[PDB]
Design an enzyme around this catalytic site. Structure first.
Site, PDB file in Angstrom:
ATOM      1  N   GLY A 101      11.007   6.885  59.566  1.00  0.00           N
ATOM      2  CA  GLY A 101      10.532   6.708  60.920  1.00  0.00           C
ATOM      3  C   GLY A 101      11.111   5.492  61.604  1.00  0.00           C
TER       4      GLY A 101
ATOM      5  N   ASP B 158      18.692   4.599  51.238  1.00  0.00           N
ATOM      6  CA  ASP B 158      17.507   5.463  51.128  1.00  0.00           C
ATOM      7  C   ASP B 158      17.734   6.375  49.939  1.00  0.00           C
ATOM      8  OD1 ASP B 158      15.271   7.291  51.752  1.00  0.00           O
ATOM      9  OD2 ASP B 158      15.289   6.299  53.719  1.00  0.00           O
TER      10      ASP B 158
ATOM     11  N   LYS C  92      19.272  11.751  53.351  1.00  0.00           N
ATOM     12  CA  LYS C  92      18.857  11.065  54.562  1.00  0.00           C
ATOM     13  C   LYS C  92      19.929  10.127  55.055  1.00  0.00           C
ATOM     14  CE  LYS C  92      13.817  10.972  55.091  1.00  0.00           C
ATOM     15  NZ  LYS C  92      12.556  10.164  55.050  1.00  0.00           N
TER      16      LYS C  92
ATOM     17  N   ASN D 101      17.953   5.012  44.199  1.00  0.00           N
ATOM     18  CA  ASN D 101      16.647   4.363  44.160  1.00  0.00           C
ATOM     19  C   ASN D 101      16.770   2.884  43.766  1.00  0.00           C
ATOM     20  OD1 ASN D 101      14.033   3.389  43.586  1.00  0.00           O
ATOM     21  ND2 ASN D 101      13.346   5.426  42.969  1.00  0.00           N
TER      22      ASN D 101
ATOM     23  N   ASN E 128       6.659   1.729  51.078  1.00  0.00           N
ATOM     24  CA  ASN E 128       5.864   1.434  49.898  1.00  0.00           C
ATOM     25  C   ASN E 128       6.096   0.059  49.372  1.00  0.00           C
ATOM     26  OD1 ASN E 128       7.783   1.875  47.229  1.00  0.00           O
ATOM     27  ND2 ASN E 128       8.369   3.156  48.995  1.00  0.00           N
TER      28      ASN E 128
ATOM     29  N   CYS F 226       7.279 -15.465  51.305  1.00  0.00           N
ATOM     30  CA  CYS F 226       8.017 -14.294  50.870  1.00  0.00           C
ATOM     31  C   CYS F 226       6.976 -13.198  50.696  1.00  0.00           C
ATOM     32  CB  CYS F 226       8.806 -14.574  49.570  1.00  0.00           C
ATOM     33  SG  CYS F 226       7.947 -14.308  47.995  1.00  0.00           S
TER      34      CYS F 226
ATOM     35  N   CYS G 240      -3.185  11.041  66.120  1.00  0.00           N
ATOM     36  CA  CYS G 240      -2.168  10.525  65.208  1.00  0.00           C
ATOM     37  C   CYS G 240      -0.801  11.191  65.382  1.00  0.00           C
ATOM     38  CB  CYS G 240      -2.639  10.638  63.753  1.00  0.00           C
ATOM     39  SG  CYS G 240      -4.065   9.589  63.374  1.00  0.00           S
TER      40      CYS G 240
ATOM     41  N   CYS H 156       3.956 -19.409  44.294  1.00  0.00           N
ATOM     42  CA  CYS H 156       4.413 -18.002  44.282  1.00  0.00           C
ATOM     43  C   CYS H 156       4.806 -17.522  42.881  1.00  0.00           C
ATOM     44  CB  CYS H 156       5.626 -17.790  45.222  1.00  0.00           C
ATOM     45  SG  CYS H 156       6.066 -16.054  45.436  1.00  0.00           S
TER      46      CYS H 156
HETATM   47 ZN   LIG Z   1       7.064 -16.456  47.556  1.00  0.00          ZN
END
Ligand SMILES: [Zn+2]
Ligand SMILES: Nc1ncnc2c1ncn2[C@@H]1O[C@H](COP(=O)(O)OP(=O)(O)NP(=O)(O)O)[C@@H](O)[C@H]1O
Ligand SMILES: [Zn+2]
Lengths: 221, 242
Positions: free
Chosen positions: B15, B36, B51, B74, B108, B150, B165, B218
């Site tokens: 999208g 992708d 894609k 991937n 995701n 981050c 929607c 972190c």
């Molecule tokens: Zn960080």
């Protein structure tokens, strides 16, 4: 689904108007009426748009609505050009880049008691806005000039994109009755400011139909 | 003009990614790298093509002058993550130079964390963007490793009828892509003020904006390393809200 039951008139089919026309077409709006003044520009847009989504109905006009003669025709189509002939369009959208046309639309909408939205983007591309006008209930284009300050080639189509998307989103919220419709939503592209407000009508507005609508609105008690 | 001199990597050509790729291509970006991993399931006749190659065909047709480099793997696999880091460090306009910006437009958390792991290792500035499943909110975030938070510095931030929607989604994507691109231009061309974080609530036309400082604890040690390298650089004059 429900969106297929509405008609929107869009005046100005360049810049923000073409993006807006295309987004509404992609959403499956029942009908779009296109007004601009130079196939002509509007019949060209109609062609492209119908290719994008053939479910959408179109009616187009190429006349200068700032003469009283053409203005008559413009009002006729606002009042009668709804999905079903003889019913009004649900919304008018001003995507025009000049004062005269804008004020012309304001004058028609005040005359008819027609809700509309007006939009604009600067030449410089650093700012734009949308505004809802409900004649008699909120400030019309003649009630006050624009006062909201902009706290100071690639950018231009981008700003047009943001303003058009925000416009369409507000059209959807207005037609489908969800969320909250903005009355005035500004966009400062340099700062990422989105000033917002709403304004009451001016009781002394120059537009005698704005004045008339205010009285009619107050009267509802 | 100047925008022709830059290379941008876009991860996720869904999208917001496709709208974003399209706008950048229309702006005349020098180069787009597209990453992708699924297929077309855009225009209906590409149903089956990857894609990335589908988007490439469309975009090239839109602006033949933009250079495209595409990858259909991937990135959450260590082997493919190596390739991904290679193209980020070396897939710039001039080969062997870094890409100027990475844009995450994936759906995701794992892919987002993956992009984050790469960017902290490399010290690569990026923007993380998304549109919510509810179709009425989205956001963009600027990550400068060492200088701003981050993706791992804190957990995911959230910005507070079907026909609603189905209609809203495309247009919220438009708004978010548009504000992403404006920020990309402001960052690349160095004018105006780049937002470190901007959310969009479509229901209320609310555009909350803020920034986040790095988390000195972190979980990402490259984030921490990058912080200390940044703290060295400045050394003269940065408060949190109390
Ligand atoms: Zn960080
Ligand atoms: N690990 C991954 N590697 C490469 N591409 C991914 C990965 N995870 C997700 N994507 C792609 O990212 C895209 C997300 O787009 P979408 O689901 O439309 O959400 P969005 O609102 O555009 N952000 C999809 O096309 C995915 O296939
Ligand atoms: Zn008035």
């Amino acid at each position: 689904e429900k969106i297929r039951t509405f008609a929107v008139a869009i005046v100005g089919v360049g810049g923000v108007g073409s993006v807006t026309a295309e987004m509404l077409t992609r959403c499956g709006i029942g009908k779009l009426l296109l007004f601009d003044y130079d196939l002509s520009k509007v019949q060209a847009a109609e062609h492209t748009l119908r290719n994008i989504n053939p479910d959408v109905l179109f009616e187009v006009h190429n006349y200068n609505i700032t003469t009283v003669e053409n203005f008559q025709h413009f009002m006729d189509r606002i009042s009668n050009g709804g999905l079903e002939e003889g019913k009004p369009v649900d919304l008018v959208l001003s995507c025009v880049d000049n004062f005269e046309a804008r004020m012309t639309i304001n004058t028609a909408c005040n005359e008819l008691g027609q809700t509309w939205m007006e939009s604009g983007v600067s030449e410089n591309a650093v700012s734009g806005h949308i505004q809802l006008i409900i004649p008699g209930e909120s400030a019309c284009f003649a009630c006050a000039p624009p006062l909201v300050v902009a706290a100071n080639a690639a950018s231009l189509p981008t700003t047009m994109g943001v303003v058009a998307g925000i416009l369409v989103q507000n059209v959807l919220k207005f037609l489908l009755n969800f969320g909250t419709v903005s009355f005035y939503l500004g966009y400062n592209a340099m700062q990422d400011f989105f000033p917002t407000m709403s304004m009451k009508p001016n009781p002394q507005c120059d537009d005698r139909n704005c004045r008339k609508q205010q009285e009619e609105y107050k009267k509802k008690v």
